[PDB]
Amino acid sequence: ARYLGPKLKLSRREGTDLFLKSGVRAIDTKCKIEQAPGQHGARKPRLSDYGVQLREKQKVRRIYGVLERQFRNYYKEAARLKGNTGENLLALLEGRLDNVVYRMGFGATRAEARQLVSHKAIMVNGRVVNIASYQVSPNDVVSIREKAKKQSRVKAALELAEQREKPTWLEVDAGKMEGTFKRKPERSDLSADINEHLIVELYSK
Template structure:
């Protein structure tokens, strides 16, 4: 199964997102009507086919891959974030997720300036985002508490941004961000604690994977 091969360098996945969500058994990219219709991988026997006992390594690998695909981070970048976290004082798994959450593309998504993280990466790359009064076009740019994030004046009528901001289906804003919806700017208040990160990721399995 090519998808789960653990290579040092992997290109960003650009195929069907529903297919990836079905591999993990949960909708990791947000609302997906196709996933809700069928939540298991395709195949002759569908959800009833027998599966052998999964090894500890395989379970850890899947969790690591799920985190990577959730945040849209390349293998080498993710590995770098892990080892950076492992050198700091604190709980490595929590520090890893905090680093992922502090990325600019993730913050743009959390502020509802984009409907998904992949869309947020495009918005950042296309120079629609200003951080502390300077245009930043690097999706992996890491924010610090107190940083101000805003939509460039000329981009405030961008249809993707407008539709995302005023989409009533989006969930509540996370408590570690501040958003001024009317003026289209937000602030990164603080590094979130693990309990404040809504993603369903078992980070300890990722720590165990890299610790082998």
């Protein structure tokens, strides 16, 4: 239920960096980011409209590591909820436990954050929570376990987290290794390069 292949391949196919690595090293120094993977990568074939919608959907799905079945459930839930479908879907995706752990900087990559959640090292409201897909709600405080609080990778990720922009919907205390999800992130806080309207019309044929 997890993609176990090369991570940079996905980034090359999408053209941009999907943040699948820590970010300590320059992306260009590890891959040919502007070139699609494989033997016939040099050519840039003219993509169809269905193609650009599918590419955007796959781009988001690979960004957050979600699979198709889970993603379609997320879309159904978002469509069911009140308001803008795209904002609801982005909020639902952003409400995942491992995603919030990555935003708080406990894990360098989202895959590392997911392994952290799954390996019983995170506690939501003091209770141990193991499910990577756990939806967190407003005013919830999340923290590392006492046993896992001495891991080198956690601090190694916290220092790296400073290089990236700080989320305005979270409050993290790097000393005690705790954060607080006070509200669901507004679209203006999210990266504007994602055209979520493509996904919301791709899935509603």
